[PDB]
From a paper:
The replicative DNA pol from bacteriophage RB69 (RB69pol) is a member of the B family and is responsible for DNA synthesis of both leading and lagging strands of its genome. It has extensive sequence similarity to human replicative pols α and δ and therefore has been regarded as a good model for B family pols. To provide a structural basis that could account for the different kinetic behavior observed among L415 variants and wt RB69pol, we determined the crystal structures of three ternary complexes: dTTP/dA-with the L415A mutant; dATP/dT-with the L415G mutant and dATP/dT-with the L415M mutant with resolutions ranging from 1.80 to 2.04 Å and Rfree values ranging from 21.3% to 21.9%.
Replacing L415 with either Ala or Gly greatly enlarges the size of this cavity. Similar differences were observed between structures of the L415G ternary complex and the wt RB69pol ternary complex. In particular, the change of the metal ion A position in both the L415A and L415G ternary complexes are mediated by an alteration in peptide backbone. The only discrepancy is that the backbones of T622 and S624 in the L415G ternary complex did not shift away from the position observed in wt RB69pol, instead the carboxyl group of D623 titled toward the cavity generated by the L415 to Gly substitution. For example, the L415G mutant has the largest cavity; thus, the corresponding side chains of L412 and D623 show the greatest tilt toward the cavity. In accord with these studies, this trapped water molecule is hydrogen bonded to both the carbonyl oxygen of T622 and G590. Therefore, the 0.5 Å downshifting of the metal ion A from its optimal position observed in the wt RB69pol structure would cause misalignment between the 3′-OH and Pα, possibly reducing the rate of phosphodiester bond formation. Therefore, the FRET values for both P/Ts in the presence of the L415G mutant are not distinguishable so it appears that the L415G mutant cannot distinguish the control P/T from the Mis-P/T. Interestingly, the L415A mutant follows the same pattern.
Residue numbers in the entry: 1 to 901
Amino acid sequence: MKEFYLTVEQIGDSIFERYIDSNGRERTREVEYKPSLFAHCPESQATKYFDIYGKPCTRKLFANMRDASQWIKRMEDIGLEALGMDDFKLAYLSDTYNYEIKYDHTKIRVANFDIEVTSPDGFPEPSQAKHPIDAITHYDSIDDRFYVFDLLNSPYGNVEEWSIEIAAKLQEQGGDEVPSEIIDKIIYMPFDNEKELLMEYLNFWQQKTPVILTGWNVESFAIPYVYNRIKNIFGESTAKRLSPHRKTRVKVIENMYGSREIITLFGISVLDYIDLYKKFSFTNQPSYSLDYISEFELNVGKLKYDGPISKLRESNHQRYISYNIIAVYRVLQIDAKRQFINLSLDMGYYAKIQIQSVFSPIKTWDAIIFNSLKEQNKVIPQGRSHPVQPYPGAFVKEPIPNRYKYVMSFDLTSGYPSIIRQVNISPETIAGTFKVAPLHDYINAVAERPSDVYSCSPNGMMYYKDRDGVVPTEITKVFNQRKEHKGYMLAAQRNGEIIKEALHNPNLSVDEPLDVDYRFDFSDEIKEKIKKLSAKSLNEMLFRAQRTEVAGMTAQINRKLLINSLYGALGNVWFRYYDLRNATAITTFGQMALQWIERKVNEYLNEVCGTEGEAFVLYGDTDSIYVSADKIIDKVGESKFRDTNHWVDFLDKFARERMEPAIDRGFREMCEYMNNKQHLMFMDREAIAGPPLGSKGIGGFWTGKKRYALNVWDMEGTRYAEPKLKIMGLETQKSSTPKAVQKALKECIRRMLQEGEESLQEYFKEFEKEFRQLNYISIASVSSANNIAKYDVGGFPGPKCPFHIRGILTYNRAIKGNIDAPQVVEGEKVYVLPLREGNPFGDKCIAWPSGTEITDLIKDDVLHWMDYTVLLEKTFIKPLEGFTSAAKLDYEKKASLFDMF
DNA sequence: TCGTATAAGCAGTCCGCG
DNA sequence: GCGGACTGCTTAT
Ligand SMILES: [Ca+2]
Ligand SMILES: [Ca+2]
Ligand SMILES: [Ca+2]
Ligand SMILES: [Ca+2]
Ligand SMILES: [Ca+2]
Ligand SMILES: [Ca+2]
């Protein structure tokens, strides 16, 4: 096989590399790598090395990495650019793996672990590590085994061995329901004392040294706790055995409001799954407890027990250990679905970076661009200091608040990356400037043509047309990968709808799910077999189709994230190729394209309807337009349609055969006007929306910018079995809105869009009457809690104290003295409830940690003093009033003359 | 919240508005 | 009461 790296580190003048050799075996080596850097030189000096602007360079080979580093400093002292890859391990990888890396994940050791620590005096601080580690479960991907290290004897209690037989049994048998599929993969090891547990763990770690290390909060809790505990008991040198090169570093993480410390383990790549999830999941969750995320992702029940966790080990050690094991498995189950480890490995090896660097698009793109240029013997520029400066972004059209019956939407495929490619926007392709006219003169095609030589953006920038820049070239490669995976995702989505249709008529029989690839549209043969299948087999196929769709979504949306973050990196001062001329060239061109094509679509539709000056485009944001189709539907007559799906086909056909060709012609003219390198503005139809045929549903509505709702029948070629609500920005989409309120507001919207005013009125009346029975957690608001200390004046609200912070301070007073009650953590999220006048907490609200029940001693009082009237008005009635006034209807029936009878 | 970008919505505080 | 200046938080893109 071809060799590939696992990890790489610089330690002084040595590179330390773990790698898989040509026989598929893990190896480690120390290499005294001699890096090269570059300086500009005279023309007469013959070289093969040139900077990105074509200026000749001489290569300087250093005796060691420390010499290169000192050379860079002295070059700053002189005032001259020091060119080349200053991160030497990236140069090492580039030299050592000078080909497209083909990696074999089965050879990479991925470890997933979790520890338990009993603590009677509140949260066990990792930096202190003053309590015994009483359980470790460590899963190894190569052995496919869960290794369990169990402490039987502790100052906080002596206990019996955990029983795998009881673990396996059902909850209803008194067991722990550890999944049967992992029961045989558990290797259980009990210990008399913590010292021998820990020494054994280190010996094990030496044998099975993680390459990728993950888990839930491992970077912030598990790793620092284990490191600092071993340090306290045995000393530093022993603690550093967690690094295969015996080197670690205490690493301070800073933000605007304080800082914390992590432990960097040299020769390990730590990918904490909580951070993978936050970056790549495209969710914003009320809570990030493993319990909460597992429930959301997997539909598994909460891991239930009696009493506080601080007494779980001594009261029920059996369950204590079983829940440690299940916690580890939960993360593997989330990854099986979401596939973020797979994503990270793909991106990391593509870029030739340390795998943990996938969190930084700046590092990722610096490595991609360096490797690309190095192939052509070109030399990268030195990074420079820049002050942070604002710059302008996208155009967003102000909609007229209203109901909108029939809507068709279009938007650009990979908008900003396509602009980069079309205009040829790159550091080394800047050709000059031209004198800019007001943006509207370009939009209306009345400004002078910018250039007859170079490719232009309306911000005044001109670019070379004779060859692609390195940014367009590399962004295209990742864009093409994105396109492939989006295709797989959309096929899986279409296949899912075929299964849902067939579930209307499930056959009474015993049979199996078909063995099919859900990434490709089902053949006619597969479709015929599906119509004969039972509900059980269809349901299992639907689940598999939906897992394939999720796998496709992860691959495509995060490749989209990566290329969009290259645009964004151009406006970040730490990026080697930072340049606000290029960032604004992209955003300003985007503004023009949107309003240019708005004009063209309006002109086109006014033409086919024989009107003048009528506005068919009702809204747009960044690179999308929403088109009113009422007049198109009315030109045929609603009476002519057999059913909903009939007019959806008609609009689908109109969009593809009439609108898109008009859109394409409009952008071809704009490309020539700007003299761009290549026409890449491709604005595909997205949504087809309207009410069910013959209903009183309103179809859709807008309240304002970034706030709308549409009843969609077809989305990018997916024809739904049942219409789907596309709701953007409204309170149903906000993590701050209470769960039960999201649900009720969504049903009100469904009724508005599908059934009409009377249906909405019936549902409102009922919700208002019954909502006081809703569980308190379901009706709590949610907020992040920053700067709690800033607003704490003697345990009371200081000036301008935010409502949610006030709630936290109220909580802090109510639990004072207790080292047992849960503390609210700075920067994490809280549930919030209003309180009726004259309550015992002495203020108008209370907040507590999100994803948890409020502690029992104040729970009853909170439940008794909850202000349901305020909660209803603020979270439900206010937003609904906004939706309904925008849609021009009433959520409460108005009086009439018929009331006289 | 260590980790690419800007535009823009709503909740709430503080206080003016005769 | 509303709305402007401001902070805080959370979306759409
Ligand atoms: Ca635990
Ligand atoms: Ca787009
Ligand atoms: Ca699209
Ligand atoms: Ca059937
Ligand atoms: Ca869009
Ligand atoms: Ca009480």
